[PDB]
Design a protein around this nucleic acid. Structure first.
Lengths: 93, 46, 37, 271
RNA sequence: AGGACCGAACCGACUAAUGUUGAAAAAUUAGCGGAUGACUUGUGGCUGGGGGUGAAAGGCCAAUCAAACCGGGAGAUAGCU
RNA sequence: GCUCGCCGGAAGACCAAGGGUUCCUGUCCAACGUUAAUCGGGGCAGGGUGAGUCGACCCCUAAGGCGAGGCCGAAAGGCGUAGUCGAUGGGAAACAGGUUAAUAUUCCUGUACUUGGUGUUACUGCGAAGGGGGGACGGAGAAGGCUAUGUUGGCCGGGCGACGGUUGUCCCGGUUUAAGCGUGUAGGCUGGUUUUCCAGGCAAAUCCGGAAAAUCAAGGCUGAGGCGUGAUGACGAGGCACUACGGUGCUGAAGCAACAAAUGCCCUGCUUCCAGGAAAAGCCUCUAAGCAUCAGGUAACAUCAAAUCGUACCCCAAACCGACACAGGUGGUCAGGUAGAGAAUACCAAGGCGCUUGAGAGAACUCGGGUGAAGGAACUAGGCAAAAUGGUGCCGUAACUUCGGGAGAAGGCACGCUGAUAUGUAGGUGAGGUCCCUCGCGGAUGGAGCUGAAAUCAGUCGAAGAUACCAGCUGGCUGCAACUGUUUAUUAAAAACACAGCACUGUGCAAACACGAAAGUGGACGUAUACGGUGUGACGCCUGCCCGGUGCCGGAAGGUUAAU
């Protein structure tokens, strides 16, 4: 088991896209941004707990932040971890 | 025309990298002079 | 925008090619000197 | 045997190769092999210390028992194998207890010949026993310097050492170089002379035969420049100096032995 | 079998033309030599300045070599311009 | 969108290094693009990189680095043991179809495979930092069996054709299907089984090795491919139905054989020759100390786990290295049709491009080419350049020679197409049918069918039959260097260097010598048939005289002479 505080600081936000929508409606999977150091074990236990669904497997990746310039000053956006969580037959949210 | 600098980050880290500089006292003088001058990218590690 | 212009001068400030004038300009000066002995 | 190759190629004109069907054609004995990496003539400092060394074919070392301290057990020679690390040839020999070794092969030694060691071993070639038990004047190779150290003298092909006199404490040996030196009595030695005396009859034939043996080109002193060698320059084939080493020491005649520790053993010097 | 023969990849550079404020701080074009060997090449390592390495030209050692580069003595000295 | 052209052993496709969002969509033309710009690898925003099986991480080590102690060194520090790190190497397993604008061995569909932990059942000896095996591996040559893959025929679907003919020996397309499981082949290796004993494998050992017998003549190991399953699944030319007119849903015939054939597999093999051809871990056994009605191990079933990191895109290039959107440089993989020996070359298939200034005029002159009267090197330092020769088979070929060569010496003949030999030859491949055994992926047979040179005779056409690209100029005298090679990257490729060969000299091993204040290392895990230095430079005939000067070697009588 994983203690509550860790399991909580792991799911950050859901990611909205038309690839997300097709993944949501056709393959029954959800893509949402997770913590930087979060693993597939802690991600799967969270979606079982806070989202009361029947999670099957977790596919993860990290998107390197794009380099953008504001005015003349150059900068690099903070890189974030992406995650595909998939479920069996049930979801309402 | 093959030029002098054909890059390879494996050779680049092993020659002037941070652990290579820390391995001897003379590189420690180099790393001191990076700090004394105050360079941002003081080493070639990244 | 043009800092490279300040740097691209600094190419033949430390040349060594003695067969060319200022490192880049090709001439016949070799022959001229060879025959001016 | 030696054979002259037909000059069907310009490089094949002057090559005489030593053939020997008695040598084994199969792979050598597995548990007596170990890694021997090439050095290139460079020491631990990385600088070239002995030049003209580099390249060549890859070689695997073979542990040859130069000590011959397995005493009293009869042994039978299995086969004769090529050794790349020596001019001579080695003999894979099987002892009576069933454990195999590599020994440096004398002349008449072939497959099926018995090998014995110790004070009870017979006086026949290939047998190893203390020098005080050797008759004076016989053909002897694989000679120890200090007792129990392992064979150090007359190792390469065609070599032998003659016993001139036995004092009882010391034994005078006429070495292959023609030097007479004293050797203490109880050093072990092997009868006969080693069996590859025609090794000096081969000729390499071309430059590649010297290159793939690990020998590099050997640029001579007068083709150098004054900053590299004492010989050099001259606007075309000028020497005008006494011939010296590249480091300035005079060669071609100058003696350089300054040991002063083994001078008590040297009865008389080579000439 | 051959440091064999003819000839592509590959390695190289013998002749000529163009180019020479070039397309290129040494190349292109038509020919040219080796092409199973002393061959060639990818990856990593080793050898450092009066030192390395050199099938030896005083060549190569980051487009720099009859003594590399960077910093310091240093505002060297200059009866010279 | 229709044509034209270029590459097609690449100017196509996939990667590694390297780059770091250039990838996709929407949006704008300030600056960048050597022009315009609606376009972009440009600016802005959003989206996109999904792994038990791919690679990294991880186990193990090579060259080497670091280096507890240790040795040595004014200091800094140098070398180095036990160890530790270090891939370019060795170690477990995933394939076919489908999907996005951008991801695919990652996602979905279908079918698989591997390694650990735990539980249960059944059996009983487990057990190393140790022993042994295995990992384990040179170059070249030669086939044989295959396969990828291509050609032809059959089958299925479609078409009677812009201008003479075309229901035909007619024209176009397709004829695809993996991993895994089982069978066990073409081959290759090894005689097998049992028993007894032993100075070895530091101790020990049933294991390795060695020595005796008995018994049988067979087993074992390895092994491509084919075969059946996987798979009455997918795909499929096309058709049907809606069309955000871009495409999107539904449905779908034949789906075979012969020939040819790899540089890919058997093959880490076989044969052969010296230059004699990594290490260690995983893996398989052996025990030691201990454990010993346990701990464990083995076989079957069940269950859990296989984390983390990269996954876009370019990668022979506008994105890497070249200051540039640069005529340059950059390692690996795939490789079809015709002609062709061929990865040459010419035209093509799939695929990608027309090179980020165009439009005219048709001066001199410059650059890259084509042709040429007559002469044919008279030009010029010099046949520089240009021109010419070019392939296969056959005939024939001199001086000289180290007997190999020279030599493709030189110099000639034939080459297309059509028919006959022979309604395609010799040959290769080879079914049906017949017979015989172990009784199969068999053996003898047998020739259907397919493929198919080479030559002769006869006729024909052109000026020309190796008609295009491609593709040796030759001979005579001679200096130098024996030769293959190497060299001043970037004005010198040579007669220069090297070279095998020869000679002299040094060196007896703790060698000589070299790098190092030293320790230590190379030499060399080599031992005078070896190693170092110098000189000459195959081979043939040879290498004459001089030791006064210099150097080196030997000598110690006498003269001189340091510190003391």
């Amino acid at each position: 088991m994983i203690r509550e505080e860790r399991l909580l600081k792991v799911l950050r936000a859901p990611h909205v896209s038309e690839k997300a929508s097709t993944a949501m409606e056709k393959s029954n999977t959800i893509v949402l941004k997770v913590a930087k150091d979060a693993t597939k074990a802690e991600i799967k236990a969270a979606v079982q707990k806070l989202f009361e669904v029947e999670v099957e497997v977790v596919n993860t990746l990290v998107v390197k932040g794009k380099v953008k310039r504001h005015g003349q000053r150059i900068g690099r956006r903070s890189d974030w971890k992406k995650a595909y969580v998939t479920l069996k037959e049930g979801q309402n949210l | 025309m093959k030029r002098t600098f054909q890059p390879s980050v494996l050779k680049r880290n092993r020659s002037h990298g941070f652990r290579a500089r820390m391995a001897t006292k003379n590189g420690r003088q180099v790393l001191a002079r990076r700090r004394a001058k105050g360079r941002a990218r003081l080493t070639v590690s990244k | 925008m043009d800092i490279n212009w300040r740097h691209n001068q600094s190419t033949f400030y430390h040349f060594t090619s003695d067969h060319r004038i200022s490192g880049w300009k090709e001439t016949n000066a070799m022959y001229v000197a060879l025959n001016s002995q | 045997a030696v054979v002259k190759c037909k000059p069907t190629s310009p490089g094949r004109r002057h090559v005489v190769k030593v053939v020997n069907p008695e040598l084994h054609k199969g792979k050598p004995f597995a548990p007596l092999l170990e890694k021997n990496s090439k050095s290139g003539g460079r020491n631990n400092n990385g600088r070239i210390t002995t030049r003209h060394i580099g390249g060549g074919h890859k070689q695997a070392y073979r542990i040859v028992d130069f000590k011959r301290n397995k005493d009293g057990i009869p042994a039978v020679v299995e086969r004769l194998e090529y050794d790349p690390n020596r001019s001579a040839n080695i003999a894979l020999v099987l002892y009576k207890d069933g454990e195999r070794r590599y020994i440096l092969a004398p002349k008449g030694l072939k497959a099926g010949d018995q090998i014995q060691s110790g004070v009870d071993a017979a006086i026949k070639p290939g047998n190893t026993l203390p020098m005080r038990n050797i008759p004076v004047g016989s053909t002897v190779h694989n000679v120890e310097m200090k007792p129990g150290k392992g064979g150090q003298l007359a190792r390469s092909a065609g070599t032998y050492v003659q016993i001139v006199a036995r004092d009882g404490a010391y034994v005078t040996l006429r070495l292959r170089s023609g030097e007479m030196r004293k050797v203490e009595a109880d050093c072990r030695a092997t009868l006969g002379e080693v069996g590859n005396a025609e090794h000096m009859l081969r000729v390499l034939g071309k430059a590649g035969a010297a290159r793939w043996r690990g020998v590099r080109p050997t640029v001579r002193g007068t083709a150098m420049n004054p900053v590299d060698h004492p010989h050099g320059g001259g606007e075309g084939r000028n020497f005008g100096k006494h011939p010296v080493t590249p480091w300035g020491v005079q060669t071609k005649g100058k003696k350089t032995r300054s040991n002063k520790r083994t001078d008590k053993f040297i009865v008389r010097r080579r000439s």
